[model samples]
Target: AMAKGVGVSNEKLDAVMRVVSEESGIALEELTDDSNFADMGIDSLSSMVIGSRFREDLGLDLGPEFSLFIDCTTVRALKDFMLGSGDAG
Candidate 1:
């Protein structure tokens, strides 16, 4: 599940995932625990787009380098990052 503090529920997270997948040209299911944003071929511009959408949908800052940090490499890691409990420290 995604972090609730981010103001997005599981359903909303799924939606965001779909959008990210489509925008990044990556398969949604493949965005599991081994997918990397860079490996998915997402560039800085795409990162900005995803971050912007996340902000618009969640109404949160998500930081400017949020995408650079989150990278969809590991679903669980991403979830923990979204929860602000991973390597954010």
Candidate 2:
């Protein structure tokens, strides 16, 4: 099984976290799984841009519905889900 924290390297995960920092305008060192996406200005980005990312691609997301979900949610699990992974089902 792929580790949920997989990649076998922090390379992909670290890259994902970097973009999160840029989007959030927070320092990379300051983020936690609990960080709010909307407060990070994630709601302002394009939907096409949002879904087009993977941790491997090193990206993040936004869209009215999803944004609301992330608004109160945190940076942890969603980051994994935001990966736009259709391979799961």
Candidate 3:
């Protein structure tokens, strides 16, 4: 689901997803909750690259511990994380 409290708009989220898809070469349709970054052939380096892009795009801090909490394998998790609900800050 889209994050309601983080002030993230559906249009902005769509744009973020588009950038992620392009950077990761992952199909937009295949980017679901079960899509594991590791399984998607994402390594640590790739994670940093993607994270940087996400932070820059969304103007979010995302923190250095982002990987510990973020699991973009699912849209729900991603949305929740971005909205500060997935992890206990």
Candidate 4:
């Protein structure tokens, strides 16, 4: 069982959340799947850093680091992007 059919796995969500937490300095214990970056008190630099982290971890060829949070607002959405399920392009 690969934990499929749920669209996104807990590990992947946790992974994305971990990066978000690390970049934003938000505790992973406090982060949630519904947590949106817009409400995190962060800006473009934060988003860019998160995107770069994703690039390094998941090998994503993301474009315009400024569009990261714009495309994937919530942690769930970020996991979708990480899984290549979202049309972020």
Q: Pick the candidate with the highest lDDT.
A: 4
Q: Candidate 1, residues 1-89: lDDT per residue as tens digits?
A: 23333433566666667667776777887777577676666777887777687778656465655663345554455555555554345
lDDT of 2: 0.49
lDDT of each: 0.62, 0.49, 0.61, 0.66
TM-score of each: 0.66, 0.49, 0.64, 0.66
Tens-place lDDT per residue, model 4, 1-89, is: 12322244567556677778888777989787767787786687888888787668855454445355566577666666655554444
Model 2: how far is 20 from its true place, Å? 0.9
Query: Which stretches of model 1 miss by more than 4 angstroms?
Result: 1-8, 69-75
Off by over 4 Å in 3: 1-7, 68-75, 87-89
Model 4 residue 54 CA deviation (Å) reads 1.5
Candidate 3, residues 3-65: lDDT per residue as tens digits?
333546676667667666776678999877676666667666666666677778766665543
lDDT winner between 3 and 4, please give it: 4
TM-score of 4: 0.66
Candidate 1 TM-score, true structure as reference: 0.66
Candidate with more favorable, higher TM-score: 1 or 3: 1
Clash pairs detected, candidate 2: none
Clashing pairs in 1: 35-73
User: Poorest 10 consecutive residues of model 4 by lDDT?
Assistant: 1-10
Error of 3 at 67 (Å): 3.5
